[PDB]
Design a protein around this nucleic acid. Structure first.
Ligand SMILES: [Mg+2]
Ligand SMILES: [Mg+2]
Ligand SMILES: [Mg+2]
Ligand SMILES: [Mg+2]
Ligand SMILES: [Mg+2]
Length: 213
DNA sequence: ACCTGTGACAAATTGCCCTCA
DNA sequence: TCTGAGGGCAATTTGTCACAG
DNA sequence: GACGGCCCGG
DNA sequence: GTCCGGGCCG
């Protein structure tokens, strides 16, 4: 039914820091780009609102503030860094935004790949819970199940978690427990996990999931 | 020294509301 | 009249650190 | 602000 | 009474 996002594993595993609104827009950019190019995409306020169940006003606010906050953002592929945009965004017409994605990023967008339908992610709120759902999809099987062990240092680096989550009780309480709850409540996935320890330190997290269909 | 969890507070983000070209 | 670009809001979540054990 | 029905006057 | 054309309004 819904638009089918596919992306290079290099992006699933890239290091960057984007908000929920920015990541929502990035899914549509990757969709335009892949159907073809020169990096130039476009966003209509009224279509965004319908896709994500917003009013026109709040869609306008979300697009406007998301687009200004891209300035200065980098993406790092492991170790190579690029800016997302190489020119500011602009409105040719009322309700329309035109954007210039760094053309050197196209090959990184487009066989080791990750794929999910846009409806799977459109209710998630915390952007770190979006990062986690993409990584698990990367290991999904046709029947929708999978199992993967992610190393904690790699999570902190790739998703760029904030500094106080280097204390493990804060990592548990404000990132791990919250994002596993969102996935279980807001997606069709059913997710469980266990901690892997070495001495007194927890080093990896092992995720198992299956599909509710 | 290390490990855990919880209570407090600060800062950020959420869906809402109203105006007006 | 419908759109969307502005200005705001309070209630909640997310980010930080002191303290018990 | 942009777009379409509607009532004016010639 | 009718009609093409503008141009104000919801
Ligand atoms: Mg944030
Ligand atoms: Mg918002
Ligand atoms: Mg939550
Ligand atoms: Mg006591
Ligand atoms: Mg003691």
């Amino acid at each position: 039914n819904s638009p089918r996002i596919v992306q290079s594993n290099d992006l699933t595993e890239a290091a960057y820091s984007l908000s929920r609104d920015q990541k929502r827009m990035l899914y549509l950019f990757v969709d335009q780009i892949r159907k073809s190019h020169d990096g130039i995409c476009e966003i209509h306020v009224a279509k965004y609102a319908e896709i994500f169940g917003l009013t026109s006003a709040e869609a306008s606010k979300d697009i406007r503030q998301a687009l200004k906050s891209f300035a200065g953002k980098e993406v790092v592929f492991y170790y190579e860094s690029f800016p997302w945009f190489i020119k500011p965004a602009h409105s040719p017409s009322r309700g329309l935004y035109s954007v210039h994605i760094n053309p050197y990023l196209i090959p990184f967008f487009i066989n080791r790949f990750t794929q999910f339908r846009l409806s799977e992610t459109k209710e998630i709120t915390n952007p770190y819970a979006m990062r986690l759902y993409e990584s698990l999809c990367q290991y999904r099987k046709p029947d929708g199940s999978g199992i993967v062990s992610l190393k904690i240092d790699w999570i902190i680096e790739r998703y760029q978690l904030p500094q106080s989550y280097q204390r493990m009780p804060d990592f548990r309480r404000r990132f791990l427990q919250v994002c596993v709850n969102e996935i279980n409540s807001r997606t069709p996935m059913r997710l469980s996990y266990i901690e892997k320890k070495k001495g007194r330190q927890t080093t990896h997290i092992v995720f198992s999931f299956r599909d509710i269909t």
